[PDB]
Amino acid sequence: REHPFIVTEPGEVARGKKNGLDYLFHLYEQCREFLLQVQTIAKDRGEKCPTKVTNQVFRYAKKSGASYINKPKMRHYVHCYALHCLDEEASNALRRAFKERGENVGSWRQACYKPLVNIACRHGWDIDAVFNAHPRLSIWYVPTKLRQLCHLERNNAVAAAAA
Amino acid sequence: REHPFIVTEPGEVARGKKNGLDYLFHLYEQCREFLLQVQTIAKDRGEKCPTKVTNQVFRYAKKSGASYINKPKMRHYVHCYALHCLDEEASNALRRAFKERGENVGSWRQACYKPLVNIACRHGWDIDAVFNAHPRLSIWYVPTKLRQLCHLERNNAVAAAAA
DNA sequence: AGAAGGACCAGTGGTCCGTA
DNA sequence: AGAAGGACCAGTGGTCCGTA
């Protein structure tokens, strides 16, 4: 079992039997590389080429010895990686704030939604288009909860701001 | 059970308990319309919006009383519809030739591959890009056999034409 | 034989909940 | 209690093969 994550500030190495948030974001980068490898082979074999991280990519990671990668964990933190990709400055500031407050990873994770919803609001509430416009982020399915919040907020927007 | 298809020429109404090929192509158009309707609702509900005909679309067709639509049949003839979309003139000519020869639908269907492979060859063998570049055709997954033939042919091309 | 489609199957997206 | 991930489940892509 991998060591649990804790909230770290940018560049910080986590002390003890813990992993930091930069390590977390690095896992997404490693997954992206595994997708590139799956795509290379699919195209060479004339097979349908995936454009997203899929079960196939996770199996490929495991086969390549990257056991510490697993689907539930990667899907769980995807919106956190999203914020890091889309507004690294805000991501860094949120990390510093939550570290200072001694918040745990679950709480920091929850706080990551709000700024993403705000980014969505600034793009006609099109969260899919937000993900797809960022090269690193475009390979990740939009998480259910994030999509629901963006929709809840757009409705409140059309409602409150129609009176 | 729907009446079986027979090879017809453009505009021809099939006589007796038979359906013609224009009727067949019309079924694809109807499916496209059902996808548009599924997309409208997905987007309004803030759900992930499909970009392809999926099980969801077929279920939607059935619910709307279009029982004569079913997945196996639509998937079976998709490359035939593809040829009609991509090179209607060649499609028409192949239909006329096979009608004249008294060929059955299975044989005409088989003959539809070749011209599609040729179209693929003219686009760097990228059959996915061929499908995606045509607005009507882009919503249909490339059929397995067509993909395999395009790959078999590209290899023969790089092989024969490297000596 | 030629052909339409119910129904199954392997593998997917999605995440719960038994575990440490 | 906070957190990592095995494993399951509903529904998908894909098409075989029992049917007419």
Curated annotation (Swiss-Prot), chains A, B:
Disulfide bonds: none
Tissue: Expressed uniformly throughout the young floral primordia.
DNA-binding region(s) in UniProt: 1-5, 70-77, 141-144
Subcellular location: Nucleus
Effect recorded for residue 70 to D: In lfy-20; reduced DNA-binding affinity with a weak leafy phenotype
Protein task: Probable transcription factor that promotes early floral meristem identity in synergy with APETALA1. Is required subsequently for the transition of an inflorescence meristem into a floral meristem, by an immediate upstream regulation of the ABC classes of floral homeotic genes. Activates directly APETALA1, CAULIFLOWER and AGAMOUS, and indirectly APETALA3 and PISTILLATA with the cooperation of UFO.
Protein name in UniProt: Protein LEAFY
Source species: Arabidopsis thaliana (Mouse-ear cress)
Upper lineage: Eukaryota, Viridiplantae, Streptophyta, Embryophyta, Tracheophyta
GN (gene name): LFY
Residues of the full protein shown: 233 to 395 of 420
